[PDB]
C-alpha cells in the first residue's frame, strides 16, 4: 500500500 524508497515516479 506504500511507495518503496527506490520507486521511480518519473518518466
Amino acid at each position, epitope marked *: 500500500p*506504500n*511507495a*518503496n*524508497p*527506490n*520507486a*521511480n*515516479p*518519473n*518518466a
Partner: T-cell receptor, first 113, second 113 residues
Framework: DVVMTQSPLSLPVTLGQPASIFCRSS???????????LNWFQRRPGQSPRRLIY???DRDSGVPDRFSGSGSGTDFTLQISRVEAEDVGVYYC?????????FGQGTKVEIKR | QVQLVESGGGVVQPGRSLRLSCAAS????????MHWVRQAPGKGLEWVAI??????????VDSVKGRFTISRDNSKNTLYLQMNSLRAEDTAVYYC??????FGSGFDYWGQG
C-alpha cells in the same frame, strides 16, 4: 513513523566560520538496495524551499560547494564550510527509507555580526 | 527556469472542501511525478501525497486518506489537491514539489506555498 531529531535547534555563527547541523533517526536509514535515503532541505527568507542534498552526500543543482553531507546508519551531518550572509534560514533533514517520509524539526541559522 | 506556483489557499469551514492548484513551468511537466507537502502550526513539515508522472499511481499519508485526492492535467501543466472533510489539523502552508527519480530522495524544486 520514524522520528528525526535535529540539533541544535538554533545555530548562531560568525560570518566565514563553519557550521555543523546534526540529525539522528529513530531507525537505521540503510535500505535493502544499498542506498541510504537521507536528504537535506533549505528554507530561506523570500525563497521557495529547496533540496540541498540527497542520498546523504549528493549535492543538487545550484547548491554551492560549501554545503556537504556525511554520516551513516542513524547519524548524519550537514556541514557548511564557511557560512555566508545568504545562508540564513532554516535547514531540515528528511528520511525517505521508511513509510511515510518524515522531516526533522529544523535548525535556524543566524549570523552574528 | 523550473517554477512552481500554488494557488487556492484561503479560509474553509471544518467539514467543507477546498481545491488547491499548482502551476508548473520551465520543465516537461509530464516527465515528473509531483508531491504535496505541508507546514502546520506545531508540526513542522509533513509529507502529504504523491502522484506519478502519468497519474497511474497515487499515495497519501494516513491522516488524509479518504479525505484528499491528488490529480493532475499534463496538458495544462497543473497539479491539483482536492481537500474534502477538512479538519482543524489541516491549517497549514501547502507546497507542491517536483518528484525525485527515487521516492526516498523526495523532491528537488518547491513552490512558495
Amino acid at each position: 513513523d520514524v522520528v528525526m531529531t535535529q540539533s541544535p535547534l538554533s545555530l548562531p555563527v560568525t560570518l566565514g566560520q563553519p557550521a555543523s547541523i546534526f540529525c539522528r533517526s529513530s531507525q537505521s536509514l540503510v535500505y535493502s538496495d544499498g542506498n541510504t535515503y537521507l536528504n537535506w532541505f533549505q528554507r530561506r527568507p523570500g525563497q521557495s524551499p529547496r533540496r540541498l542534498i540527497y542520498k546523504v552526500s549528493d549535492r543538487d543543482s545550484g547548491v554551492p560547494d560549501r554545503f556537504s553531507g556525511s554520516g551513516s546508519g542513524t547519524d548524519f551531518t550537514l556541514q557548511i564550510s564557511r557560512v555566508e550572509a545568504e545562508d540564513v534560514g532554516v535547514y531540515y533533514c528528511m528520511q525517505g527509507t521508511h513509510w511515510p517520509p518524515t522531516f526533522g524539526q529544523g535548525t535556524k541559522v543566524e549570523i552574528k555580526r | 527556469q523550473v517554477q512552481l506556483v500554488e494557488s487556492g489557499g484561503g479560509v474553509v469551514q471544518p467539514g467543507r472542501s477546498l481545491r488547491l492548484s499548482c502551476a508548473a513551468s520551465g520543465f516537461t511537466f509530464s516527465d515528473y511525478g509531483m508531491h504535496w507537502v505541508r507546514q502546520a502550526p506545531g508540526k513542522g513539515l509533513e509529507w502529504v501525497a504523491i502522484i506519478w508522472h502519468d497519474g497511474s499511481n497515487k499515495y497519501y499519508v494516513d491522516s488524509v486518506k479518504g479525505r484528499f485526492t491528488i490529480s493532475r492535467d499534463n496538458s495544462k501543466n497543473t497539479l491539483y489537491l482536492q481537500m474534502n472533510s477538512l479538519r482543524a489539523e489541516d491549517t497549514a502552508v501547502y507546497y507542491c514539489a517536483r518528484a525525485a527519480s527515487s521516492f526516498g530522495s523526495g523532491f528537488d524544486y518547491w513552490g512558495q506555498g
